Amino acid sequence: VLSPADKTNVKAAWGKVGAHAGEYGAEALERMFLSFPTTKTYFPHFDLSHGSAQVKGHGKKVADALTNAVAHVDDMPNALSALSDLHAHKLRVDPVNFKLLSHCLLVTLAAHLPAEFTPAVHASLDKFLASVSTVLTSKYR
Amino acid sequence: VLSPADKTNVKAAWGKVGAHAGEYGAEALERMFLSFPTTKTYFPHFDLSHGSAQVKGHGKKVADALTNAVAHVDDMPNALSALSDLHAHKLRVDPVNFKLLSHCLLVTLAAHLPAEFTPAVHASLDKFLASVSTVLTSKYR
Amino acid sequence: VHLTPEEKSAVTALWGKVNVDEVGGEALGRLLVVYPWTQRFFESFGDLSTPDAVMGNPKVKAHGKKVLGAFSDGLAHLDNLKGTFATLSELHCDKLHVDPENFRLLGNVLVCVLAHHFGKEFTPPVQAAYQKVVAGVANALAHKYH
Amino acid sequence: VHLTPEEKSAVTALWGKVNVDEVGGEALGRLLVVYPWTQRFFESFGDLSTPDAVMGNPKVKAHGKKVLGAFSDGLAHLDNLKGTFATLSELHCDKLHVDPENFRLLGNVLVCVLAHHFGKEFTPPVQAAYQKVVAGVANALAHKYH
Ligand code: HEM
Numbered sequence: 058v059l060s061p062a063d064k065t066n067v068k069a070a071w072g073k074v075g076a077h078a079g080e081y082g083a084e085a086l087e088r089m090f091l092s093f094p095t096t097k098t099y100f101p102h103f104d105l106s107h108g109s110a111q112v113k114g115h116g117k118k119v120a121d122a123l124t125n126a127v128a129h130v131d132d133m134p135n136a137l138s139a140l141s142d143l144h145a146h147k148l149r150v151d152p153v154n155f156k157l158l159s160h161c162l163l164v165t166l167a168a169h170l171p172a173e174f175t176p177a178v179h180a181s182l183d184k185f186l187a188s189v190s191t192v193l194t195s196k197y198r
Numbered sequence: 199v200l201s202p203a204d205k206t207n208v209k210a211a212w213g214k215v216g217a218h219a220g221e222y223g224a225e226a227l228e229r230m231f232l233s234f235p236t237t238k239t240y241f242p243h244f245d246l247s248h249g250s251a252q253v254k255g256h257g258k259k260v261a262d263a264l265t266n267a268v269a270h271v272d273d274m275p276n277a278l279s280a281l282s283d284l285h286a287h288k289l290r291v292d293p294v295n296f297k298l299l300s301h302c303l304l305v306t307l308a309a310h311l312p313a314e315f316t317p318a319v320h321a322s323l324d325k326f327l328a329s330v331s332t333v334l335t336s337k338y339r
Numbered sequence: 340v341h342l343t344p345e346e347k348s349a350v351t352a353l354w355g356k357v358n359v360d361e362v363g364g365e366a367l368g369r370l371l372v373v374y375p376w377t378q379r380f381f382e383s384f385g386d387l388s389t390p391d392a393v394m395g396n397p398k399v400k401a402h403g404k405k406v407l408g409a410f411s412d413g414l415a416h417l418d419n420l421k422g423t424f425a426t427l428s429e430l431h432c433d434k435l436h437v438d439p440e441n442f443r444l445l446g447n448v449l450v451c452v453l454a455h456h457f458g459k460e461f462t463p464p465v466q467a468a469y470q471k472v473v474a475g476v477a478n479a480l481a482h483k484y485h
Numbered sequence: 486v487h488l489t490p491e492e493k494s495a496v497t498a499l500w501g502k503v504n505v506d507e508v509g510g511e512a513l514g515r516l517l518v519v520y521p522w523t524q525r526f527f528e529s530f531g532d533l534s535t536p537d538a539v540m541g542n543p544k545v546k547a548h549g550k551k552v553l554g555a556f557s558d559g560l561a562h563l564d565n566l567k568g569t570f571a572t573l574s575e576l577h578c579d580k581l582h583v584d585p586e587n588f589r590l591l592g593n594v595l596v597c598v599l600a601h602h603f604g605k606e607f608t609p610p611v612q613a614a615y616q617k618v619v620a621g622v623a624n625a626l627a628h629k630y631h
């Protein structure tokens with residue numbers, strides 16, 4: 058559960074993200090692939106060389122989805138509905154990996170938004186990532 | 199989400215526990231401490247010795263709450279509110295420990311209900327226990 | 340891993356009792372049912388749609404025996420879990436693309452199948468000795484990921 | 486911990502930029518904020534009522550530096566983290582009763598602090614160097630737990 062302060066803090070931070078959502082989403086995935094090498098097991102069909110059109114396309118897709126999630130923060134379940142089925146029925150990514158991706162997004166954001174990334178926004182984002190991951194995972198079994 | 203089939207597996211299994219719930223509570227505890235030494239850090243005021251009254255006394259409290267969770271499977275958040283408050287605001291037990299106890303629980307169930315403990319039932323009990331832990335930690339932040 | 344004399348003997352004793360053939364097919368079977376996402380590595384296995392389908396599945400059965408066969412050989416080299424598994428570790432990573440987290444899952448499911456098979460013989464202290472082995476085997480298999 | 490010569494260097498290089506007290510207070514406070522449950526060890530500290538209160542807590546500040554003081558000292562021993570933290574591992578377990586989970590959490594908060602502090606300089610490859618370092622210290626503070 059995201060408090061109203063939470064959503065205010067998410068809506069604000071993400072706003073700053075704005076147009077870099079795509080690029081921050083690629084950097085996040087490059088961050089995860091590097092720190093947590095096991096996440097790779099899910100993209101053996103990607104060229105994971107830095108800058109690959111694939112990682113760039115993927116990061117873009119991931120960000121849209123987050124923004125979709127920010128835009129519909131009061132009804133994430135319904136909004137990520139399709140993503141949820143995809144994750145649970147096809148991709149079937151172990152739920153722990155979400156947590157690693159969350160952490161990498163949080164570091165991407167920390168590094169891009171010096172001004173906005175206060176103790177609070179930080180708290181709120183993390184909760185937000187926690188919620189997004191819960192939703193994408195909710196239809197697992 | 200706990201399917202009608204899950205609730206039926208859960209109530210059924212829990213049905214077999216009967217009056218040994220306290221007992222299985224204590225054992226589960228005992229399992230946890232022994233297999234995951236780090237959980238002990240939350241109980242430096244107890245005598246965690248085998249056959250310990252304290253553990254015994256706590257094992258029963260734990261078991262009753264699950265008994266209650268079961269009674270109210272369609273209304274866990276309400277039933278477990280004071281519990282969720284207590285762990286969140288007073289005990290502050292890290293959420294990771296809930297997964298450890300859940301496993302020891304399962305294990306104590308496996309070893310006690312040979313007939314009952316079917317793959318399918320193993321499955322609902324695991325969902326149920328993930329739901330419980332979800333409730334109990336829902337107010338941490 | 341490091342196990343006390345008492346823990347080593349708990350492990351060994353119980354394991355000599357185990358019929359790998361069928362404890363493996365159960366462990367794998369149960370993995371596929373409790374953590375359905377693990378089903379991704381076994382599309383060629385036929386029908387996995389129902390617990391019944393998964394438990395009665397012969398490829399699952401065949402595979403479980405294999406996995407556990409290996410698991411068994413590890414028990415024998417408890418001292419050097421890493422050396423033992425590197426080849427399978429490498430295979431698991433490079434050709435199979437199996438997230439190491441699936442090793443942890445199976446390990447936990449194995450413990451449940453043990454407790455379930457042996458009931459009360461599988462005590463707390465036995466459980467603990469067996470939790471350190473599973474953890475050690477999982478790290479042994481995750482060891483060569485890159 | 487296994488770091489290549491290049492990884493040790495990114496680690497030390499960037500660390501030399503780090504003001505310990507500052508990042509100490511920051512990381513500790515951020516920990517208590519983001520993961521409230523962590524405030525449990527800290528009732529004597531006074532007001533922890535709000536983020537502002539936490540981050541402004543001189544007790545938090547003082548506990549923060551001591552903690553990163555030790556961290557900082559352990560980077561000179563990247564080869565024997567275990568040996569370095571043994572005593573502190575025991576104290577945490579025996580007297581403090583600190584769930585080692587808190588160490589994994591503090592490490593992530595840390596990494597986030599570094600990213601906030603360093604911006605661009607904290608690159609993907611640097612992150613990974615530091616992730617290992619943080620897993621390293623957490624695994625080492627947890628090693629003497631029984
Ligand atoms: C914050 C959590 C996540 C979000 C917002 C997210 C979102 C998405 C989206 C929007 C897509 C594209 C779906 C489509 O094209 O219809 C996707 C696909 C995918 N995701 Fe997730 N995802 C997340 C977590 C993860 C994690 C943690 C992993 C693995 C470590 C993962 C692995 C995959 C894979 C492998 C694909 C398909 C890749 C391809 O074949 O192009 N996702 N995800």
Ligand code: HEM
Pocket residue numbers: 237238240241256259260261263264281284285289291295296299300330331334
């Ligand atoms: C299924 C999950 C759990 C349930 C249902 C449960 C339930 C309970 C209940 C009913 C009580 C007693 C309430 C009271 O009398 O004030 C309690 C207290 C407590 N719980 Fe939880 N709990 C769970 C998980 C955990 C975990 C994982 C830990 C730590 C590893 C933990 C640590 C404690 C502690 C330290 C106390 C109070 C100890 C005492 O002062 O006697 N709980 N819990």
Ligand code: HEM
Pocket residue numbers: 377380381383405406407409410427435437441442445476477480
């Ligand atoms: C952790 C204990 C494990 C051990 C010791 C182990 C061992 C093995 C061995 C011995 C093989 C044989 C390949 C051959 O016969 O050449 C194998 C293959 C395989 N394993 Fe594992 N395994 C383990 C767990 C897992 C888990 C948890 C999964 C996924 C959930 C997995 C997925 C597979 C797959 C997909 C194959 C290949 C099947 C094929 O050719 O169609 N393994 N494993």
Ligand code: HEM
Pocket residue numbers: 523526527548551552553555556573576577581583587588591622626
């Ligand atoms: C890198 C991680 C950590 C390091 C290196 C570390 C180091 C230290 C040191 C060097 C001290 C003083 C030891 C002494 O008395 O000789 C200490 C005390 C203590 N630590 Fe840790 N610590 C770490 C993480 C944590 C965390 C995350 C918490 C709580 C969540 C914590 C809780 C405490 C407490 C409560 C004390 C006692 C302070 C006092 O009594 O005044 N530590 N730690």
